[PDB]
């Protein structure tokens, strides 16, 4: 009993851990327990591939489950690494299963950095191994048949799946063995052989000849189509062609022989004989042309006995006319087989090593989302500040709201006194004197770290160039020069960072030198400060004016409008939406994650209320600034240009500008300090990459 099976494809060993850990780390918190398992999974994985492919093969469910498990686990990884860009290069090398190449050289090999290549080959080997285990079943007992039937159908389904994916999964052309046509024929061969197995069960179970005939006929139809496909393309091994021809005939004969029994049971004696003659013709040709692949003697004898006896009853008793074959009805067909669909997991008790790892399409949509959210928040925030800066600068420009608090040109207007006290309580100038003094020191600290860092590289690179010089042979290595190119690139950037930071130091310092005198004045105790603000004769005409009460509450609103920006900015920054689980839903419930529409929609939901209140502020300020500029210049009519009051006005306008500048300056200095301290953190790390690498060398 000869059944076709397929040989496994050979692959070269390939470091599977390498491109995976590399990325794994580029992706997680170093030392972080993420890496603790994900890197520990890409180990088991490489050790699995070794087992599922490198091993000299053992024809049992053990080695097949390992191979099945390997197919599963590979499929479970595609969405969780950036194979798509393929910038994560790992190369898979497979040989042809049949040594089939268009050009006349035995083995044609093919290596590809396509996980789709890997997938098709593992699956082909899965179908082939299944085909070999099927072919070994004992088709005399009930479980031999069940296992063979299940495996031929599995192989059929796997080969078919390969036929329908292989090209989309590969850029270029496949080796022959796995090309859609070769795998289409193998899938049909496997399906034919599973029909055969069912024909054999039907037989062993002594079912009605009508059934057995239809089963055998169906099998013949399968074997015949596979035969045809092979007739004018020779991409399968040498013994496959004759064997298909043989089994095609032997299955037609079995169909004839069983139908002939049905004919005799119906007294169609002429048909019985015609069908047996056909069966004998077929089996006779098989016996003499494919004796190398097939044994048909028992079948030939059983037919010959039935034909002899049928002819005896007919020649002597029945005298029924024997029909031409062209004139018989077709025998029917009944299929009990299905090529089995591939639906990972195909292995039993599958467990996905990287189940917890986040789909790469989700992490990309999360990052994209944050660049979108930062933009939303920063924009809104910067818009507001600029607007507050503008309004404060305008009010100063108008001596507002000092002017309308200035009842007697004799004392410190209340707004000035409040601002003064506000400044004194935050330390006064000695607060700004400190930050300005310590700024050049935080800068130095960082130059120093960057400098010692790079000196390390310079010094180790030096001895390395010397050693290679005096010991060419015993000191062969990649030069330090080449190894250090990356780190010296970070270095150079860092340098350009310090360039910008210093540039900003200079701007802040020039602002501090140009406003430090007024501020020192602003910080004086009330009487001393008052005695430094020139007196003026206050026009009492102003108390109660229409221009004044309007301006006054026109200014009240402007104040509320700006203390409002404080909560606003604080709310923009204090909220956050974790979008992962919303991205997961879009990916499970759907084929793809469309983040743009998804995040735009969530941003509008989370931030929309504020990005609208913010938006209100600005145009509400515009309304206020417009109304104030006009309503003021009317207050400018009642205004009276006497040099006593002009001096007073100068000084008041300047103290208010001084408050603004104090507030702004302190903020640019705290900012700059936070920056230099973060920079120390980042630079200290960079100094570790440097020493670690000078001492691994």
């Amino acid at each position: 009993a000869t059944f076709i099976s397929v040989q496994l494809k050979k692959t070269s060993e390939v470091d599977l851990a390498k491109p995976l850990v590399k990325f794994i780390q580029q992706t997680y918190p170093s030392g972080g327990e993420e890496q603790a398992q994900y890197c520990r999974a890409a180990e088991e994985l490489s050790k699995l591939r070794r087992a599922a492919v490198g091993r000299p093969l053992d024809k049992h469910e053990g080695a097949l489950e390992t191979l099945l498990r390997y197919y599963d686990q590979i499929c479970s990884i595609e969405p969780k690494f950036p194979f798509s860009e393929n910038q994560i290069c790992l190369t898979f090398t497979w040989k042809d299963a049949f040594d089939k190449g268009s050009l006349f050289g035995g083995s044609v090999k093919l290596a590809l950095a396509s996980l789709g290549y890997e997938k098709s080959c593992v699956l082909f080997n899965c179908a082939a191994l299944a085909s070999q285990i099927a072919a070994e079943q004992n088709l005399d007992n009930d479980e031999g048949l069940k296992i063979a039937a299940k495996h031929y159908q599995f192989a059929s389904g796997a080969f078919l799946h390969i036929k329908e994916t292989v090209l989309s999964a590969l850029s270029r052309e496949p080796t022959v063995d796995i090309s859609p046509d070769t795998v289409g024929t193998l899938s049909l061969i496997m399906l034919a052989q599973a029909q055969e197995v069912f024909f054999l069960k039907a037989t062993r179970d002594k079912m009605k000849d009508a059934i057995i005939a239809k089963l055998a006929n169906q099998a013949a139809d399968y074997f015949g189509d596979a035969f045809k496909q092979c007739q004018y393309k020779d991409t399968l091994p040498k013994e496959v062609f004759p064997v298909l021809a043989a089994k095609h005939c032997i299955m037609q004969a079995n169909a004839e022989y069983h139908q002939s029994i049905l004919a005799k049971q119906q007294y169609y004696f002429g048909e019985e004989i015609a069908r047996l003659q056909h069966a004998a013709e077929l089996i006779k040709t098989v016996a003499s042309r494919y004796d190398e692949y097939v044994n048909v003697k028992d079948f030939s004898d059983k037919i010959n006995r039935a034909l002899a006896a049928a002819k005896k009853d007919n020649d002597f008793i029945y005298h029924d006319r024997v029909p031409d074959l062209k004139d018989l009805d077709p025998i029917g067909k009944a299929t009990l087989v299905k090529s089995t669909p591939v639906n990972v997991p195909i292995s039993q008790k599958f467990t996905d090593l990287f189940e917890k790892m986040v789909p790469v399409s989700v992490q990309q949509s999360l990052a994209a989302y944050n660049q979108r959210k930062a933009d939303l928040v920063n924009r809104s925030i910067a818009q507001m500040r600029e607007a507050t800066t503008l309004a404060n600068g305008v009010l100063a420009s108008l001596n507002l709201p000092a002017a309308i608090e200035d009842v007697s040109g004799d004392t410190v207007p209340q707004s000035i006194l409040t601002k003064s006290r506000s400044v004194i309580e935050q330390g006064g100038i000695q607060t700004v004197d400190q930050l300005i003094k310590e700024l050049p020191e935080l800068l130095q600290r960082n130059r120093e770290i960057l400098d010692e860092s790079l000196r390390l590289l310079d010094e180790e690179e030096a001895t390395d160039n010397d050693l290679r010089a005096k010991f060419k042979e015993r000191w062969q290595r990649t030069p330090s020069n080449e190894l250090y190119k990356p780190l010296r690139a970070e270095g150079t950037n860092f340098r350009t960072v310090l360039d910008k930071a210093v540039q900003a130091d200079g701007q802040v310092k020039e602002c501090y030198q140009s406003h430090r005198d007024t501020i020192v004045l602003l910080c004086k105790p009330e009487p001393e400060l008052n005695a430094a603000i020139p007196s003026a004769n206050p026009a009492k005409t102003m108390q109660g004016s229409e221009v004044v009460n309007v301006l006054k509450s026109l200014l009240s609103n402007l104040d509320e409008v700006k203390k409002e920006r404080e909560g606003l900015e604080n709310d923009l920054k204090s909220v956050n939406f974790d979008m992962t689980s919303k991205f997961l839903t879009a990916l499970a419930q759907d084929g793809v994650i469309n983040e743009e529409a998804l995040s735009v929609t969530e941003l509008d939901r989370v931030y929309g209320g504020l990005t609208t209140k913010v938006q209100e502020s600005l145009k509400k300020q515009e309304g206020l600034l417009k109304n104030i500029q006009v309503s003021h210049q009317e207050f400018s009519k009642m205004k009276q240009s006497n040099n006593e009051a002009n001096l007073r006005e100068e000084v008041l306008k300047n103290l208010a500008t001084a408050y603004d500048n104090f507030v702004e300056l302190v903020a640019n200095l705290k900012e700059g300090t936070k920056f230099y301290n973060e920079l120390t953190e980042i630079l200290v790390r960079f100094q570790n990459k440097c020493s670690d690498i000078v001492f691994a060398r």
């Binding site: 950037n493 350009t496 960072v497 910008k500 930071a501 540039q503 900003a504 701007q507 802040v508 640019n668 900012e671 700059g672 920056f675 920079l679 980042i682």
Partner: peptide
Amino acid sequence: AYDPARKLL
């Protein structure tokens, strides 16, 4: 004021 430098990080 130090925003331009944070950008380069």
